[PDB]
Amino acid sequence: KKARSYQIELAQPAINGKNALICAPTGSGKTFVSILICEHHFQNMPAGRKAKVVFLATKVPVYEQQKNVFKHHFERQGYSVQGISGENFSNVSVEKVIEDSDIIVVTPQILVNSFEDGTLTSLSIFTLMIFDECHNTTGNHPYNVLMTRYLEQKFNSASQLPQILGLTASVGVGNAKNIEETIEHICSLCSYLDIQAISTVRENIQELQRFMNKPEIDVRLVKRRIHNPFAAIISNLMSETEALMRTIFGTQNYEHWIVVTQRKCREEESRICRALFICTEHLRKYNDALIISEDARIIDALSYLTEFFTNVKNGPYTELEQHLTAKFQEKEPELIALSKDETNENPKLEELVCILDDAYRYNPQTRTLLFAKTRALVSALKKCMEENPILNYIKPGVLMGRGMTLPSQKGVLDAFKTSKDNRLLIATSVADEGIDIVQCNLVVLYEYSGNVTKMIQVRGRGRAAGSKCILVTSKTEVVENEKCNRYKEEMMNKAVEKIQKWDEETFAKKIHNLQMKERVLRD
RNA sequence: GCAUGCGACCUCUGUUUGA
RNA sequence: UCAAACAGAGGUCGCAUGC
Numbered sequence: 432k433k434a435r436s437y438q439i440e441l442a443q444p445a446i447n448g449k450n451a452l453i454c455a456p457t458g459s460g461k462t463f464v465s466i467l468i469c470e471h472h473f474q475n476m477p478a479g480r481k482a483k484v485v486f487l488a489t490k491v492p493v494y495e496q497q498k499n500v501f502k503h504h505f506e507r508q509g510y511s512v513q514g515i516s517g518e519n520f521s522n523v524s525v526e527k528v529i530e531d532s533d534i535i536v537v538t539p540q541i542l543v544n545s546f547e548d549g550t551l552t553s554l555s556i557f558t559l560m561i562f563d564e565c566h567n568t569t570g571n572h573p574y575n576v577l578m579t580r581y582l583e584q585k586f587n588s589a590s591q592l593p594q595i596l597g598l599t600a601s602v603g604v605g606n607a608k609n610i611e612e613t614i615e616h617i618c619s620l621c622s623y624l625d626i627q628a629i630s631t632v633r634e635n636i637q638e639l640q641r642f643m644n645k646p647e648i649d650v651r652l653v654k655r656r657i658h659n660p661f662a663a664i665i666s667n668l669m670s671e672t673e674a675l676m677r678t679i680f681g682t683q684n685y686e687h688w689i690v691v692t693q694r695k696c697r698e699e700e701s702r703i704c705r706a707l708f709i710c711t712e713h714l715r716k717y718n719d720a721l722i723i724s725e726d727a728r729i730i731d732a733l734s735y736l737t738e739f740f741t742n743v744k745n746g747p748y749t750e751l752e753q754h755l756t757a758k759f760q761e762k763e764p765e766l767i768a769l770s771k772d773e774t775n776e777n778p779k780l781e782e783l784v785c786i787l788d789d790a791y792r793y794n795p796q797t798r799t800l801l802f803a804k805t806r807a808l809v810s811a812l813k814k815c816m817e818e819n820p821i822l823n824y825i826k827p828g829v830l831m832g833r834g835m836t837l838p839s840q841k842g843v844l845d846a847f848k849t850s851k852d853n854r855l856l857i858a859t860s861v862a863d864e865g866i867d868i869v870q871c872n873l874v875v876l877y878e879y880s881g882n883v884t885k886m887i888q889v890r891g892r893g894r895a896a897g898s899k900c901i902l903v904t905s906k907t908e909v910v911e912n913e914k915c916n917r918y919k920e921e922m923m924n925k926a927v928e929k930i931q932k933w934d935e936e937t938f939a940k941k942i943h944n945l946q947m948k949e950r951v952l953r954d
Numbered sequence: 955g956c957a958u959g960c961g962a963c964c965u966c967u968g969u970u971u972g973a
Numbered sequence: 974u975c976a977a978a979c980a981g982a983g984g985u986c987g988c989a990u991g992c
């Protein structure tokens with residue numbers, strides 16, 4: 432692992448002391464650049480005043496990952512590298528850990544936290560800050576909260592602040608519909624993080640196209656399976672429950688409307704009150720059951736329901752709770768017969784099955800990441816893997832936050848990198864940024880939509896020459912929005928390539944002009 | 955529990971072209 | 974008045990993540 436020539440090139444503007452943003456493609460080794468910057472920070476430190484470096488990483492696993500690189504590289508040099516975090520925060524006084532540490536890796540919230548906490552009131556304490564996936568500097572996200580602070584202190588003392596460093600493979604594109612606006616948005620981002628130079632692989636492009644490369648995002652539309660009995664059955668069982676509401680579908684809006692009706696109603700009042708807290712719930716859990724089958728199997732939907740109708744007995748189980756539960760159990764053996772179906776299943780799941788086989792026969796040692804939007808879905812997908820004879824080649828893992836333990840995470844990832852047991856990892860948003868599975872080959876998106884940023888960062892989870900990235904939708908708009916992104920992403924690059932062709936003064940001037948939009952008076 | 959990003963939804967007030 | 978488009982201010986909700 433010898434410094435690459437573009438890596439040393441990207442370094443330059445930061446070593447000349449300037450607040451840099453390092454835009455360089457997903458996987459190019461920006462993290463190395465930042466440690467290289469870090470050596471040339473300690474090296475060059477003037478006087479007796481010495482250096483504290485803080486690396487900030489957005490989500491926990493990325494904090495862990497980067498914390499561990501940084502230790503393995505600087506501890507042997509004889510540096511104190513300590514990681515404060517969500518686990519560590521109410522076990523340590525930040526005060527000390529900084530003054531003990533030459534390098535602190537941090538979840539960004541912690542510094543925010545400890546700033547309101549009193550523990551800390553001077554960003555001056557560090558001499559270099561690094562923001563991994565720095566593009567997250569928006570509105571009231573921690574990064575900006577801290578950076579607002581940084582900017583205030585700039586005027587309120589003009590007495591040395593730390594050097595800033597943004598790493599990002601995805602500078603973004605605001606709402607910019609035109610290249611001119613995309614530039615206004617990028618320049619906006621540079622202002623938030625007080626950038627004075629943007630770093631690009633300018634001169635060493637050829638070297639860069641070697642090491643990391645990217646392809647298309649194979650989009651796959653599957654039409655909703657014609658003849659869907661299950662959808663009709665529940666909708667009617669909901670219609671009869673909506674008919675009964677006056678006497679006293681599978682969309683987001685139905686959930687929104689159920690909460691409209693649950694707040695309005697919150698002893699001819701009191702018996703009608705908790706009558707609608709019985710009507711709304713059943714309608715809601717029917718609704719959730721539709722939308723759970725939308726992606727999963729019917730067997731997951733009916734699971735979700737028996738899990739509710741056996742729970743209707745537990746609590747009150749009043750008159751109405753009996754007349755509704757019974758309406759279901761008449762029409763239940765109809766459904767459990769449909770569970771047992773062969774052909775009539777979600778064709779999104781038929782395609783994934785196809786897709787995973789297509790890749791695990793052609794290459795038996797592939798490592799996939801299957802991304803889904805929601806925990807429930809991610810977890811329900813693990814069931815869909817295990818229980819399918821054609822796909823249980825591979826043990827599947829799951830990655831998450833917590834409603835999964837932070838140690839339980841360390842395990843599944845550490846496993847998935849090198850196990851050759853579980854060669855596929857279903858994950859959620861935690862995994863979509865900054866995370867480095869060297870042996871990862873394929874990344875599959877299961878109704879994983881999104882911003883340009885997401886759909887750049889996610890396909891970049893696929894490393895190691897072997898790269899492929901396959902989406903699976905049934906929706907029109909999702910097939911399009913994503914195409915839309917492939918334009919926005921092209922536009923994004925030019926924005927920068929262009930911005931880069933300005934002179935020092937005029938870029939600098941742009942950022943100040945933008946910052947001056949955010950000052951504060953003193954009297 | 956709280957925060958944030960993101961998405962859906964709705965409202966107000968204005969500008970555009972249309973009928 | 975209607976429809977369609979853009980933008981400024983606000984209300985609610987869902988997901989994910991962070992503390």
Ligand SMILES: Nc1ncnc2c1ncn2[C@@H]1O[C@H](COP(=O)(O)OP(=O)(O)O)[C@@H](O)[C@H]1O
Binds near residue numbers: 600
């Ligand atoms: N000069 C180098 N030579 C060989 N491997 C490198 C070099 N620099 C970085 N890498 C490796 O590239 C992989 C991904 O790097 P990373 O910096 O996380 O990508 P990103 O820039 O998207 O964050 C890591 O395994 C890292 O060790």
Ligand SMILES: [Mg+2]
Binds near residue numbers: 461462564598
């Ligand atoms: Mg990185």
